[PDB]
Amino acid sequence: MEDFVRQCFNPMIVELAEKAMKEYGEDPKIETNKFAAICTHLEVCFMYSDGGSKHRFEIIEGRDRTMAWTVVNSICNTTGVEKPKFLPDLYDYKENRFIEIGVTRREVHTYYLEKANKIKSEETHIHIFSFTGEEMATKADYTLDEESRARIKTRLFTIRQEMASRGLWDSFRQSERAAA
Numbered sequence: 001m002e003d004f005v006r007q008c009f010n011p012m013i014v015e016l017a018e019k020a021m022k023e024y025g026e027d028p029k030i031e032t033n034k035f036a037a038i039c040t041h042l043e044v045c046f047m048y049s050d051g052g053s054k055h056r057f058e059i060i061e062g063r064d065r066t067m068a069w070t071v072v073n074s075i076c077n078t079t080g081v082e083k084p085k086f087l088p089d090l091y092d093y094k095e096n097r098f099i100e101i102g103v104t105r106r107e108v109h110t111y112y113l114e115k116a117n118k119i120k121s122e123e124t125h126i127h128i129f130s131f132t133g134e135e136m137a138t139k140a141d142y143t144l145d146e147e148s149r150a151r152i153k154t155r156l157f158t159i160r161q162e163m164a165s166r167g168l169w170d171s172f173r174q175s176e177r178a179a180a
Ligand SMILES: Cn1cnc(-c2nc(C(=O)O)c(O)c(=O)[nH]2)c1
Pocket: 041, 087, 101, 102, 103, 179
């Protein structure tokens, strides 16, 4: 499993996963499912930011916690936007709002209401992707164009197929159900 992760994602993502893992106190060699999930969340987040005009998105995910909070504060103190209570993943300079990306292995609408009640924000936008090509967003506003969202969708599934081609998909979808 660990070997798969390291040859499936790019070193830059892999390294960023390992960092966040050790911060929480988690061993990337023992909890290899959480390893793969973080790598995935990262990738999805980067492809999502890619998706706008050059200066559009601010990437909050992947940074160091302290530095990430400093970024948020800078936005709130400049746009007027209400400060969130938990760390989002992006900010949209076009739609004047924060974004939270999720990647789940259970239902889009199940994961949505777990994240929304956790943030309790009438301003932070939400967007959930699935390993089955499904998506849900606050007020059904999906931010990006069809082509962009479809690419991430495609990719997520390619990983889903890839794990299953080694018999790691069952264990991976079970582990998220084992977490909640
Ligand atoms: C219960 N749980 C397990 N993993 C997460 C989780 N944590 C984070 C995080 O920022 O720590 C995410 O961005 C994310 O998408 N999921 C939450």
